[PDB]
């Protein structure tokens, strides 16, 4: 269920984490108390991607980097989390490269297999209405209910 003819080089660069849906209420709640700054997608050695997220947590700038290892079809990745004792499938399901990308993740190993999440990445920090609806429509088709779909607070700090 990857974006057809996915081109990794065009997915590189700056993105803003503008929305999320998840079946984990804990995760949604933790994320919403953060303020998202910017994300950066960079090439990784294994042929995949390094995803670096910058955010505000209790008024402090924080950064986290995740290695997205190539999995199957181009646009699909695996993320290993030692903390969660789990591996997650991560897929770029839909993107036009220059405005939005929709990512979908679910566990593939360990207790994390119970976990599902959709993310809206936008090239602009405030996405147009058309892009927000693209995200909500995707989330609804994937069985996320209305109150599990979150638009995330943003910040201009940390940059």
UniProtKB/Swiss-Prot annotation:
One of its GO terms (cellular component) is rough endoplasmic reticulum. Its main location: endoplasmic reticulum. Induction: By IL1B/interleukin-1 beta and thyroid hormone. Probably induced by dexamethasone, dihydrotestosterone (DHT), progesterone, retinoic acid and retinal. Repressed by the Notch-Hes signaling pathway. Abundant in the brain and CNS, where it is expressed in tissues of the blood-brain barrier and secreted into the cerebro-spinal fluid. Abundantly expressed in the heart. In the male reproductive system, it is expressed in the testis, epididymis and prostate, and is secreted into the seminal fluid. Expressed in the eye and secreted into the aqueous humor. Lower levels detected in various tissue fluids such as serum, normal urine, ascitic fluid and tear fluid. Also found in a number of other organs including ovary, fimbriae of the fallopian tubes, kidney, leukocytes. Changing residue 36 to A: Reduces enzyme activity almost ten-fold. Transmembrane segments: none annotated. Glycans are attached at residues 1, 23, 50. Forms a beta-barrel structure that accommodates hydrophobic ligands in its interior. Monomer. This is Prostaglandin-H2 D-isomerase.
């Amino acid at each position: 269920s990857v974006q057809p003819n996915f081109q990794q080089d065009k997915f590189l660069g700056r993105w803003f984490s503008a929305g999320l849906a998840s079946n984990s209420s804990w995760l949604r709640e933790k994320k919403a108390a953060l303020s998202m700054a910017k994300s950066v997608v960079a090439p990784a050695t294994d042929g995949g991607l390094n995803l670096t997220s910058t955010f505000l947590r209790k008024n402090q700038c924080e950064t986290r980097t995740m290695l997205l290892q190539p999995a199957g079809s181009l646009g699909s990745y695996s993320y290993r989390s030692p903390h969660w004792g789990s591996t997650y499938s991560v897929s770029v399901v839909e993107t036009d490269y220059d405005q939005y990308a929709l990512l979908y993740s679910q566990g593939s190993k360990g207790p994390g297999e119970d976990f599902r999440m959709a993310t809206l990445y936008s090239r602009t920090q405030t996405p147009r209405a058309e892009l927000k609806e693209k995200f909500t429509a995707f989330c609804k088709a994937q069985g996320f209910t209305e109150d599990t779909i979150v638009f995330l607070p943003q910040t201009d700090k940390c940059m």
